[PDB]
Amino acid sequence: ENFVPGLDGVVAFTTEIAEPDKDGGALRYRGVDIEDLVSQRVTFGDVWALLVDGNFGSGLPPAEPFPLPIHSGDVRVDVQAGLAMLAPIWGYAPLLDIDDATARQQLARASVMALSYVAQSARGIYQPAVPQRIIDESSTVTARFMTRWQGEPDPRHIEAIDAYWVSAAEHGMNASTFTARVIASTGADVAAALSGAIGAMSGPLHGGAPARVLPMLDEVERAGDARSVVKGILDRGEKLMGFGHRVYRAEDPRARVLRAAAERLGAPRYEVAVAVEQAALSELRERRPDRAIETNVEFWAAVVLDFARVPANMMPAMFTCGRTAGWCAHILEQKRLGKLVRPSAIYVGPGPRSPESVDGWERVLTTA
């Protein structure tokens, strides 16, 4: 009794990093609203520094040249493995043996190299790399990532990614952030903790499937037939991509800034995407008025990411790129805390028995 498996609602830490007000419909990084950051066009490197350091003192340095050595065919796997291999070649010591400033420099160096590995993996092995002198023509971390990936970077496409990365940078104690904090609490080096957090984010229960709303949006060709299409999908017993039970008590403020960014940047799908949003919401609240139904953040993430020419198989990696900022801030906070996380379990399995009583002992005898 008094037991719900899964630590649901158990307080494990106190953080000073970010506060997601579920009741007030707000998300603030160190007290600053994400809407202020996105509208005022603050780039990812500065939001990374604000979350990790607590102010706008010193941003994010550019990535050094380092051709990706892993080509597994899965962008996630490439960066999970390539990050772990940074510790030997760069001489990363365990967190126990370094001071706070050294951990911050190591976290910044590994974060920006993750973005470089993602861009190289997405560009693919069947293409020559983009020369370093062209990459160096840009001055922001986000612009260099786009140049390294696509060659010529469309400036309006870069602003879409900076909007998306800033709104996905940090969102509390998600499972992949919890994993990074657990690995860091054992004293391991920063690369081992980042690498494990990527493994957690790879799980399909980490969020939504932005790529799945694009085929629906492709069926609707004008704002007028948005109601008719939503009629058909709901009548065929299928599900509506991008809508469900509310996560925030009203709406996710992250869906707000992504939609506003799509309008401000003049994304072609905006007109049709707004029409599908109101069509889907009017229907779902009509067929089942008992549930609080809202637009999920995955819906407007698909519009912003697709407008920036990000393919479907690459959309999960673009979320991981942004979340490195939250991961690094929690790793640095876990280091200063200095307390190993170590929960408990309760045994309910079989009582004491002899090996001969177990089924299969005969095989152990015949073989051994």
Added chain:
Amino acid sequence: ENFVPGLDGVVAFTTEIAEPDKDGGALRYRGVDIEDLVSQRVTFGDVWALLVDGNFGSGLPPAEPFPLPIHSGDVRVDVQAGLAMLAPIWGYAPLLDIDDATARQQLARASVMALSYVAQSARGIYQPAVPQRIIDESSTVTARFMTRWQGEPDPRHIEAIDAYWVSAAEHGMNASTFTARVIASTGADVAAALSGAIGAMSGPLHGGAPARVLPMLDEVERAGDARSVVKGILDRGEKLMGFGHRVYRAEDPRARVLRAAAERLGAPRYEVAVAVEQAALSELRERRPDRAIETNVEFWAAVVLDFARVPANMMPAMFTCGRTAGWCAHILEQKRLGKLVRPSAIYVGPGPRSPESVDGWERVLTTA
């Protein structure tokens, strides 16, 4: 108030896998004492199957040929990265999309390939690989590991590893086991969860340093001068390697079976190691009789591992090899549970402010 950071003493799961009785000085895998397993010479592959399945039905299959592709200079890094890259090439789906029997087959295939990667990495790149036809002359997982690593396998050295691996296979909800369960609870593939657990085990707070007791044991050349040496180390203000506050209410039963195994196998250091054990214990209980002082399991682990010709830099990887059995059983149990672990945090950071109030806004202005 009512808050101790780190989930200390919080119950997160109920397991049927193993019960470490801290008060009774016992460790049982599915109800079977580890002393019965070690003395009756039950090999690692069968203990792996007992922990994962719950009986001696079907053991562990041999590893397929697969030259290690990672050569980072750190055995841990090689296996952490090489495990994650198994998912694309072998077509591992997420845990959500497969049934229980398929996850068990995937876990067995990845476990035995971890052991093969450890053996290849330890043997090193400056040596030609051991032919597959020689490896196939052995019939157990533990013997093949030793053949792949050292060429000729000493049978008494193989029994030392089977004794050590069985006693290190599983020990409750350690941080690296907790990490594997958290990654698995997101629905990720089994290779991603094993890879992250290795990152947690790499942290120096995961256990002891077996390699550190060997230099002390090398100073003592006969049983007689063990008291004199322990006198010197304690008088120079240094620490005694392998002894400290008790973990089990009496002694770790794992230290029991390791010491008994060292005696039964006739390890040359046994005579001197027993003499140092009683010398160190008699002193520590004499200088501070207020503390319950016991022999740590790292002490007899060093004797067993060194007797099997395992170098110091390789001793951490030999612990990870054994713990794969506990990792796989908890991953399979977490899958059947079907509940994402997702704890909570409490914000205590700065309240709502405007971006211009933050220190460093001026830099953001001059640059942007």
